[PDB]
Amino acid sequence: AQYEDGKQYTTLEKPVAGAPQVLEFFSFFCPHCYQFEEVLHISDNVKKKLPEGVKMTKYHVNFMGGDLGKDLTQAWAVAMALGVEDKVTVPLFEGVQKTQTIRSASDIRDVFINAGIKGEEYDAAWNSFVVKSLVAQQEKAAADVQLRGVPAMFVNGKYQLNPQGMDTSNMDVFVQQYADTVKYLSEK
Amino acid sequence: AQYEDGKQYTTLEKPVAGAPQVLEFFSFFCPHCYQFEEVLHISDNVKKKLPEGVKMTKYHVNFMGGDLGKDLTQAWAVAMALGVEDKVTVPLFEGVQKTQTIRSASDIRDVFINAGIKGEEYDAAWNSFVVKSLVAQQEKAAADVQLRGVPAMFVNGKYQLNPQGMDTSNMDVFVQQYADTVKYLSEK
Ligand SMILES: Cc1nc(-c2ccc(C(F)(F)F)cc2)sc1C(=O)O
After folding, report:
1. Which residue numbers of A have CB closer than 8 Å to B's CBs?
2. In chain B, beta strands by DSSP E
3. Is CATH 3.40.30.10 what the domain over A1-188 is classified as, yes or no?
């Protein structure tokens, strides 16, 4: 791999200060986001190659979800607040897109309860100031990088991953090129 | 429901003569269209609510996806001509938006093959004047209603569905309101 601005990544005209080191955006409605997370395991594969100390951040957005989309963003805030992202990401993606068992906020709550989060705890977090702030943070971060679509990933508020210019003849190779690019950018 | 023009539906300025009773437009590149098919099953649920004998028509549009977009419109003509819409809708949607493995006309052809359509039969259809006419029909129909985006549904060439004005907190409530609006308009 030979890295060039415009090839594996692009450079934001307006860099974001104080941005997370590695910031990924997604939506539980987004088919290619399902592909990224549930099939390719982009987040996990990127994390595996990240330099020690560099943490990953993942935010939910709402391009095609209406009110339910907003519920999902707030629920993702709850997942972050409780630190249970690795417990609810799979049943949320599956429930929305595959089994079609997630149709409302109540169904989202049921997913957390089934994953081991007590209903009272979910509700406390849901109505918490921490989650209210996390919802605002997700929205602001999207605005800051002038987010146009998902999935997307940004490194140090400066660089935007560009998977269009990566090898896709093989999904295993794509994942490695993608993850290697994040590693490279994080080291810049 | 209190139906109001501008809320659940809009009224075309110049209604289309001889227009299909129920006419849907979509694109395989269209994210809400993907949702309308896989998660909400709008067409199925509208059909269920309408009387037996109301014709539903669904056309593909050109203005998403560049050259592959035109190819998909021709491919949808093939599907209509062969009567295999239900065999190819999901793998076309997922090939375009989920796995992104549909990149050329050849990839579209592969989907039809894998869905059981004999290759020689696809090719004969692809190059047929019956299909050429169906492509023209889809384009003319969109032009007749001055189509600006997808998804879109028109009733009796008079009214256009307005999902933006509907409740989006619960998927099944949205589908119910959508289908109920179509029935209301059909009886107007
Ligand atoms: C076509 C469309 N469709 C929308 C939608 C449909 C269903 C739902 C939910 F299922 F979540 F209820 C949300 C948004 S918004 C929308 C638009 O063009 O504004």
Report:
1. 29-32, 34-35, 63-69, 71, 96-97, 100, 103-105, 168
2. 9-11, 22-26, 56-60, 152-155, 159-161
3. yes
